[PDB]
Amino acid sequence: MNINPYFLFIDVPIQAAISTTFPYTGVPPYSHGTGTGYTIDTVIRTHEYSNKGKQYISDVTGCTMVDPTNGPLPEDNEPSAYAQLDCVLEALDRMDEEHPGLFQAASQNAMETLMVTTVDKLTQGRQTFDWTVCRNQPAATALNTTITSFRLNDLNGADKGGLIPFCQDIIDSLDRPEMTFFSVKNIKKKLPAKNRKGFLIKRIPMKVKDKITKVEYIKRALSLNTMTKDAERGKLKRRAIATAGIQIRGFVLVVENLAKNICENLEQSGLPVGGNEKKAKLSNAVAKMLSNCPPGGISMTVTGDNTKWNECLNPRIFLAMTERITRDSPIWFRDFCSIAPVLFSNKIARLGKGFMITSKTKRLKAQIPCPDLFSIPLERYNEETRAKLKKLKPFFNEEGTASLSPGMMMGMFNMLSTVLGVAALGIKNIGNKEYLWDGLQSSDDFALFVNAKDEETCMEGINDFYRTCKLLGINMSKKKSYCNETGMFEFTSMFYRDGFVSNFAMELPSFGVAGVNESADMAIGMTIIKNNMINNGMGPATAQTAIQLFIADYRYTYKCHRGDSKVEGKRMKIIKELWENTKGRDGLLVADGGPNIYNLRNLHIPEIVLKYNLMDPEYKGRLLHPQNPFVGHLSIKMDYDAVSGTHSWRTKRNRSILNTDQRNMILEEQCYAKCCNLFEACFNSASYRKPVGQHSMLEAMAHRLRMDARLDYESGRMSKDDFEKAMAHLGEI
């Protein structure tokens, strides 16, 4: 008797048992080595979709530019990037006509937001391309380097605090003939020592001023870094993703804020709608389309998906979109909003590491940097790369980068593109034919409803929608998209079948131990179960099972099995002692080899708070010692409820930096850290609330400490000695 797990689908329908078609217990595919091939693929294809447009050499950068917009319409189903401005403007006019006031209101909100937005805002951009060192760095560091660099070119917009002067300095820095910036280099110095030879050589780092010419700077300012996307689910082959510089961030923020402020008020945009609310939108949007045409009215649903979404959409359109949307706004704001598209219209793409060539005979390998990419016979590359490199040539730059005028990068203008999709959804009809379409949009993923009298019309409506989208540079995936009679459909891995079904598989990877620490991961671990019980349809048995499995994973990962158990380990050896010593054993946390007291009803309660009354005074005292060394200097995506105890620790820093030339940044860091740690002692609220001021960081501390001294004296805390000493010290400062 041959078992067939598919045969379940004879009994239970596919949506009802959709969880079993997701292999999320398995491993997701990671990348290996270089992504240059994947980047080059994108560069070639992006131009492949627009090569019948207008080619021209940029007199600024000296790069090869291609312009599809207002180009010849396609005569085939190959991904077209040839959008038509007029049609976009009409699609916009329709949206404005049906949503009047939104266009200017959103702009005013975004403007009034911008005006308040400070520079520090840029620090929360995660990985950012640092143009000074030409590497992906933390946003804060990439920003700091850019500010310190700007300071050398007499650009102190940052000192004012606001974003506007900084952005001004950014667009101004383009005019600079030679951009100067710091670069660190080492120096030997004989420090005194008790070392036979009475001295020691420590390489003290020192900063050096380095110059870049206007063009070479502009090229970096316009550059985008690239890397293969790891762990991307539900796909065979890998692909590339990009990272932006510090310059464009401020200009994108505003545009996305605007597009957000717009999208929020649209009813056919699924962004920034929470996954839970997306159903509230979708099911209703369906309910509307259902009861609209009773008499033989065939309501069809189309499970949409777009191809080459990023590689077809052109900045030149987004510029027009900003220009239209900002109609009523003043000029400076239009000029402000217009910049990011202008940059993306003239952007440059970096090609990652390169390609590794080898000899099996000699067992040798070597990476060929993108500059040296062509310093070799093309026959020595493999068959595909040989084809790619030939096609890359016309868009290739001397310094080893690829010019890329058309197309967008993976995840840049999500909002503003979603708007362009909704704009397609806004037409609803063409030529007064007997049908009406509506739908929901989300970047490259869309769901299209079509109501009409007979399906022959519906299909022509869908065809009209397709042919329409072509004019916006939006390309529907004939291969991945499919249509059916309304009642069931799929949208961003959410499955509707006369009501959205659960897809428990999707969230299953989150059940594991998160990797923050012992304290947090518990809270997270229970909270995930608690939430998945509510939203994703997990019964009490399965939930209670997950409660067990998580503790199982938790105790192995953090090596903290039951104190009564006999599992051996360095920690366990002490845990057992703690078990023997402690009286209120049920008061012990699992991290301390305590018993799991959680169940369905108290998932939402922190373990410490649960067990507090069961703890011994010394154990809770030690566990919650106010000045314990394990918890660091805290400072106020999902958040959790947890208590700050000894299990709330932080791990060691990655030490690989120690034996590289970036050692400096440790001293550069700690140099700040000292000043900030002190400034926090002077101003305790600094940790909570962002301090404000364009004045000197020292001045504040001086004044504050002076007042502290004076008041501590006159109140009767400090003695005349301490006051005179304090004032004597401060006097010098």
Added chain:
Amino acid sequence: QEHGIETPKYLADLFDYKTKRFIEVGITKGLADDYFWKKKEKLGNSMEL
């Protein structure tokens, strides 16, 4: 807060340590009496005018 009194709602100019009183300085052109009672409307009697 240290002296233990109410915080002025506006930003004063000086503070007298012996009197424990905030002081608001005004530089008028014409008459002083005109500039005085106008301040009295805002500051009431929080600061010494």
Added chain:
Amino acid sequence: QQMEAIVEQESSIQGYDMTKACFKGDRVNSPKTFSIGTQEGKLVKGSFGKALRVIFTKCLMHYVFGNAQLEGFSAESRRLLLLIQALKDRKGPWVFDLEGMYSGIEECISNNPWVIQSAYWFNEWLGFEKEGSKVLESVDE
């Protein structure tokens, strides 16, 4: 979870805990039976527990043979699954480039045992469904 969903859905229908009923049967109801697999070219009815264990096993095999081929195959085949459901429900489904779907799926079938077996199972099932369709095709008409 996938089965407790069925236990809950059933318990909804009869207003009490239908677990024992689904597993073993009871005073009122018979035990739950699923189409579990084939035997000399004909269906076979397996119990709830077997249907559970089959899914557990499948989920294990998802890990034990988990890779890009499985991801691509599952993801791309899920569509064809959904279409087959649309056909089963008679919701008149339309396609735009089926060769694209197929070409998308079949490139993921190379040297992954679970993929290569799942394809076979999929074809067997797809086979057995077409015999079922013959019941609906001539209803009313």
Added chain:
Amino acid sequence: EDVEKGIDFKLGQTISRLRDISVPAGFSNFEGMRSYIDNIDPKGAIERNLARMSPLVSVTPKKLTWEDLRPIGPHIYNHELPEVPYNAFLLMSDELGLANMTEGKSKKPKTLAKECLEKYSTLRDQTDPILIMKSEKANENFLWKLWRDCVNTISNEEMSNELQKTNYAKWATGDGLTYQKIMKEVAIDDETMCQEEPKIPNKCRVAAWVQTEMNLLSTLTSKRALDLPEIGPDVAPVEHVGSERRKYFVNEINYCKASTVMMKYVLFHTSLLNESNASMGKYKVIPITNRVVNEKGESFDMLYGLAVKGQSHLRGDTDVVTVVTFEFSSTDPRVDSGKW
């Protein structure tokens, strides 16, 4: 003396010049596009375009019928291809666990495997290799030497589970097999060096061992393998319903085969990861352990085989550690050679 406070933000020559060349075709400069957008009314453009666009651009829709659904993967039935071979990390259905009754509490793995092999000495003492089947590019001598080194190393009286870095171990682990990195300047001059053509997965056909694996792994046993920890006491009815449900749901899986296989994988990987980081440069022997409880309620420790950990200086997450598996079985590979 009063003045209006406007926002100061104006564009320079460079960024302006950039903007000027960031326009659609048919525009002399940006101001043109700005005025154009601000002024002209494009109503009718969409339809007027759709009118002139080629008919070839379409969606080419077709209503789906069952006969259009041709069987996927036509090549998997072709016998001209090689049937897909077993490629998992450990054995699943074919596993054979040496059982050792214990108190039912944790002991040291070496001691466990030692006592297990002590119980089943007849196999442990076998130094005479009877080779049945041989992987194409394997080395019988090295492998058997490695097996004996494992058995003896574990069976000995000392604490360490470290293996001597012998030649057979260095082969089985793959010592020094990494290529040497060199300067681009050299590689560019070296004309013999080339980009390697990538290895693409082979096109296998269907194999019945999968089907059987499915048939067997889903079957019941009298042996429970799961290590499910305790939870809080029940209070709310929901918790009692859940707890009562678990008795039906959990045990139905726990008693089945796949559960033990899974627990084996889990518990193995758990230790393998620990050794991989704790003892990077040391070749170490790790037992394939799994505790099991029978229907009577007696804790049998199961030893399915022994594994050799390679050199694990793992930097990148994807970096590989080579692990050599020696696993007991009752399956005669000659029966289904295509599997092995």
Added chain:
Amino acid sequence: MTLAKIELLKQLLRDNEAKTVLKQTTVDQYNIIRKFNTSRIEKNPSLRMKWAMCSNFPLALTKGDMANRIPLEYKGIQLKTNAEDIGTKGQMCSIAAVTWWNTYGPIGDTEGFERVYESFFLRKMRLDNATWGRITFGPVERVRKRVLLNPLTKEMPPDEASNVIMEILFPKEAGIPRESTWIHRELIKEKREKLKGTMITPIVLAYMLERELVARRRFLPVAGATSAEFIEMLHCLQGENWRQIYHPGGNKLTESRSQSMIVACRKIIRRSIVASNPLELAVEIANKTVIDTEPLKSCLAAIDGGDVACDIIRAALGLKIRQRQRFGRLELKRISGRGFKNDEEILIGNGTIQKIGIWDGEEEFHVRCGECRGILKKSKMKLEKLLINSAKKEDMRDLIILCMVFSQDTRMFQGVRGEINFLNRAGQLLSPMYQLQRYFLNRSNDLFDQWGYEESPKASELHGINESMNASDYTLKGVVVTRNVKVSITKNLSLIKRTGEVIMGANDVSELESQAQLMITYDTPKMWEMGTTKELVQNTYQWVLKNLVTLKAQFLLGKEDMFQWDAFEAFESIIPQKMAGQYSGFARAVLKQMRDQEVMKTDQFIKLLPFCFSPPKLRSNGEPYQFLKLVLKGGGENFIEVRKGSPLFSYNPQTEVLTICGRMMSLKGKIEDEERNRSMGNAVLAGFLVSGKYDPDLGDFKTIEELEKLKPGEKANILLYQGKPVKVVK
């Protein structure tokens, strides 16, 4: 401590780097240089942790004495190492070091801990003190709504909350005084007193404060209970297919009762309306309804709120009826006069037409807003008199404005400028009057200017006031500030007074069916009856299937005996009363077709049998109303198709599987032999039979308007479901 800070400052300033950093860096830029580090973002912490935990010394300590109290090793075990951490510049250590510290470390001060983390403990007491109820299996309609996740101390906007936190924790650094301080001075005082002696770091106190001040509102699938102290237990309260009665401990709000009470009463009424002798049901149910813990009696008795339904029930059990209304912030009680709403179109001041319900008839209310009280006398679009008391200016103002708007005066309607069709922050369109309220509450100058003034009252006790809420000789037209501060119920739930007049209309309650706040329980058999559309639908069809054995048999014996059955009363309470009869008359006929003639369809019988309860309504001709789909109350989804399947009801004849609201049922072993090639046309229209198949010469598929107008014995084409043409005759 100051001396130490200054000394450290001087020691730091020696370092030229630190000096230049302190001199060059700005107070703004502090926010940047703080986040400067060599650290990188962990993209796979789940893995990196599992890896790191297998290392020797993964953790980093803080440099200090408490670190030095930890020994290097302990009984062979290496606790920590000499090597410093790059980030902390303190020693590194193994996780064991934690387990040591917890076992043999220094015992620290934990006084205040409970008060600091009070917010969390309140959950623990809200669970520990709670009491659980019954668990019930059966369908549950979950509505996805934004809700408050946790109960707060006092809800504020983030900006307002942060300032309070700042006032509590860092009073010297609060900066510019806000009004908030004066509003929450008692809260500040309290938290200041509660959090004084503790040793815990302020940054934690601010976090816990912000947790219990700032609100966490999120979209969730909810059913019944929506109060925070219910939401926090939501995972246990319900599923899709089960319900759990839960009674949380601690005190509960009054408004939370007032919220649910109304829904409960409305829901009782909506059910009891359809059944004859409504009062009987209403009383039967209301007697045994429960709001969390309080009975509806106790609630209606104790609370002085209600609206319409509440009074009707109040008069059904026997107690006073507070005819009170709420216009946003304005609270009204009825003194005399019963007005009637009439939908008209008004051209409002700014120059736009608006469909508004104008209230005809004279009315007199006892009025209160915040602290300001008064008496209101109004007529159709006119403020006749407004006799208020003196109070705070904003209350007097808002009272007068809310009265001006509530009165629907033309002087108000013709006082609009700009636009008044703004949505709320979520993006929802407010109602015509509430928009005018939200508008004129802000921009009142137009109203006050457009209103008009007149002579003040010269009676000693009376006074008049002006636009700025100050005494004046010229008062606002119709405004005065004075110094001085049985019933029975019908069978059909209308309240009558001794003089015969009716004051409450059974058809005067809101049809709007909102989610309650607390646990709405019905301590009676058949709870479902007071349920949602789909719940009732499902339970009904289930009850049909459960008794199909007898129901299908009696249909060949008892003529109209089945059509009326206890269970169907509920179902009918779903159906629009304007269609119930038309549906019943059709269903009964289509069924009678399958009875009297030899063409049965069990799947259809089951589908239609519930619709036949309500007394039928045929056309003038005697023929019933033909239908494509039978619509139900609420949600465009909720309808039963006649020819095709539907979101609520569908049938799969391949497996003989009936789908009800998603749930699966098996009809196998309960179907006749000849239902194989039995077309559906013989049970789609009443008095119609299939002759042949689609004959092109007959033309197109004829719609209901045509089919009803076709003469008897006349062929026509009909489309069952998509791709199934049929040739039918009357």
Added chain:
RNA sequence: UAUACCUCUGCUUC
């Protein structure tokens, strides 16, 4: 050339 059967590193990007 050497120190170097030494030293540092396991997400730290060139």
Added chain:
RNA sequence: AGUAGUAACAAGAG
């Protein structure tokens, strides 16, 4: 060898 799969590891660095 092997892991693995459109490119890598099978240690790297001073």
